[PDB]
Write a protein that binds this ligand. Structure first.
Ligand SMILES: [Cl-]
Ligand SMILES: [Cl-]
Ligand code: NA
Ligand SMILES: [Ru+3]
Ligand SMILES: [Ru+3]
Length: 129
């Protein structure tokens, strides 16, 4: 499912990401835009053989099991496939664990490079929330 921008802002809010660990909703939308272009099915292989999955490109090195990332962890206790569902519940719950881990949203390289320090509130402009 490719979410619309406001559609995804609404779902993220519903699931409690608005100001989670202090990050306003626009941060999460911006991260999703540049991680996956709002496509829940997005996947991308990393150099180390790990893979990023879903709307927030959560990595199999630490967070989810895909059966093919040797020596990895599954800290969200989920198959990485669950991160590709049209329902974002699993992504959001796992993102909450990630963002709580110490480096906040810097965990997401695209957030750090493309969202951090920018006017992220623009990502939710015009949305009914
Ligand atoms: Cl594995
Ligand atoms: Cl922080
Ligand atoms: Na894993
Ligand atoms: Ru850790
Ligand atoms: Ru503005």
């Amino acid at each position: 499912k490719v979410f619309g921008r406001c559609e995804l802002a609404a779902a993220m809010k519903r699931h409690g990401l608005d100001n989670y660990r202090g990050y306003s909703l626009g941060n999460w939308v911006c991260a999703a835009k540049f991680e996956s272009n709002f496509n829940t099915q997005a996947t991308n292989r990393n150099t180390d053989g790990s893979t990023d999955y879903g709307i927030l490109q959560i990595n199999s090195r630490w967070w989810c099991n895909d059966g093919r990332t040797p020596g990895s962890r599954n800290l969200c206790n989920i198959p990485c496939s669950a991160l590709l569902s049209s329902d974002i519940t699993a992504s959001v719950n796992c993102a909450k664990k990630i963002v709580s881990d110490g480096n906040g949203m810097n965990a997401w390289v695209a957030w750090r490079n493309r969202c951090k320090g920018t006017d992220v509130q623009a990502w939710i402009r015009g949305c009914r929330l």
